[PDB]
Design a protein around this ligand. Structure first.
Ligand SMILES: *CC(=O)Nc1ccc2c(Nc3ccccc3)ncnc2c1
Length: 274
């Protein structure tokens, strides 16, 4: 059924590799295979498999699909569909200025559609960032998690994640109430989405640049907000500003985000105003 082709990276419970899957009756496809490390503990086997149960609960075109889970043979495997263009952040950094605005709004509409599905089921992601968005050959963007351990680290002195009692926290992507009081809701994912919008419109620039993680929290509290990226339509920036309102009750819902993006797609002339 499954054959590993090449080790593409490492995960927190073992290795992550590219391979092939032969379904009985269906055509052979390229898949991503997660393996459990040799000499694993009772907790590690439970934690690795529980992450498959979370992913296995979702069926949507903009959410990474779980093909199957191997449990009979040791080491155990998690099998998901292959995403040829890899992580959205690196993909945009390599393809700088190569897409029209319509194509970028299309990428954003998919992420928003995927996040709307998650919000319906009262699922809070807690780590929505372009680094956790996977892209396929048809440029379809999918909300991911529990993937590669490695990620882009622009400056280890202002790391992407800061350790917290409950969990790791990505300062630049997290809502100020989430940072301050661990108030993680679908409204704090909306703040993260706004950050993702800015990542997509800037072709993978670092949110807040040179500013330290502490300077970000302070600037945000003093009502600073990221400026519009170069040649970004005003409507999109205004949408990012709605996502970044301090009052979390005024931020749009993911269904409202989808509707605004569909409205901009229906009237493409509106996207000329910069
Ligand atoms: C270029 C590159 O590294 N491409 C990748 C990386 C990761 C990945 C994954 N990750 C994943 C997420 C959750 C569970 C298991 C694996 N899936 C699909 N394609 C890729 C491509």
């Amino acid at each position: 059924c499954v054959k590993i082709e090449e080790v593409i990276g490492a995960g927190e419970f073992g290795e992550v590799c590219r391979g092939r899957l032969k379904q009985p009756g269906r055509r052979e496809v390229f898949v991503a295979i997660k393996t459990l490390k040799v000499g694993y503990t009772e907790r590690q086997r439970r934690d690795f498999l529980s992450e498959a149960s979370i992913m296995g609960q979702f069926d949507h075109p903009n959410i990474i699909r779980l093909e199957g889970v191997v449990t009979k043979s040791r080491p155990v495997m998690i099998l998901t569909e292959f995403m040829e263009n890899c992580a959205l952040d690196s993909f945009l950094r390599l393809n700088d200025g190569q897409f029209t605005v319509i194509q970028l709004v299309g990428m954003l509409r998919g992420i928003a559609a995927g996040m709307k599905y998650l919000s319906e089921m009262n699922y809070v992601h807690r780590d929505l960032a372009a680094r956790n968005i996977l892209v396929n050959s048809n440029l379809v963007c999918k909300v991911s998690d529990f993937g590669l351990s490695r990620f882009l680290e622009d400056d280890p002195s202002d790391p992407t994640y800061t350790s917290s009692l409950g969990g790791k926290i990505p300062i630049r992507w997290t809502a100020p109430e989430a940072i301050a009081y661990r108030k993680f809701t679908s409204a704090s994912d909306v703040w993260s989405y706004g950050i993702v919008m800015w990542e997509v419109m800037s072709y993978g620039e670092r949110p807040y640049w040179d500013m330290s993680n502490q300077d970000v929290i302070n600037a945000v509290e003093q009502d600073y907000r990221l400026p519009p990226p170069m040649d970004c339509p005003t409507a999109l920036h205004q949408l990012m500003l709605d996502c970044w309102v301090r009052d979390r009750n005024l931020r749009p819902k993911f269904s409202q985000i989808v509707n605004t993006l569909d409205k901009l797609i229906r009237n493409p002339a509106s996207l000329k105003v910069i």
